[PDB]
């Protein structure tokens, strides 16, 4: 099935998921000289006080940390959103080298990595139904650059030996996602999609202008993960990002001048 390699990477995806060639695909390039500052835009409200992380998983494409989404413990609201979106997971994408790794790009620039805090619209009852709705998901995307270390990522880095290969998971309780946010919540926003199959166009993307810094030692530990399962030839999990897709008929709004 799908991956990032020459035989099953982003250029092949459309054969199984034809929406890959659609009108609201993600990620995109964020052109800061055409993104418009938007007045109707409230500030973003991140309410992650009650967040409960469940498990971390190497799914053979990335890793995800999964969250207890049985109640309003961790919600995103405000900004461009209507209603209340519950955090269900975060996924991470990164590169083989520091100059690539992000899915979204800003003025064609690629960051070392990109995190997604994935939330589903409470009015659809669950994630399954949510993803079938054009406004069903809100994804907060945070760029990472290699500079100093992020302490709130170290928990994650420290568990990665336990999930080196596809299929492996580990308990990951009491992880605080607030520790993955930059200082500023200035953001750009646009309608798009999942960046991995099934690539459904159900996403209000909210991409933060301010990147976080991670150490070279932190990102290096992501690059030691594996795409393959235990007892298969070792294939390092790197470059698990989809490249920027056609903007087509969409405007990217900025929450800031
Ligand atoms: Zn992701």
From Swiss-Prot:
It comes from the Eukaryota. This is Carbonic anhydrase 2. Keywords: Acetylation, Cell membrane, Cytoplasm, Disease variant, Lyase, Membrane, Metal-binding, Osteopetrosis, Phosphoprotein, Zinc. Zinc. Can also use cobalt(II) with lower efficiency, but not copper(II), nickel(II) and manganese(II). Changing residue 118 to A/G/I/L/S: Reduced CO(2) hydrase and p-nitrophenyl acetate esterase activities. It is found in: Cytoplasm; Cell membrane. CDD domains: alpha_CA_I_II_III_XIII.
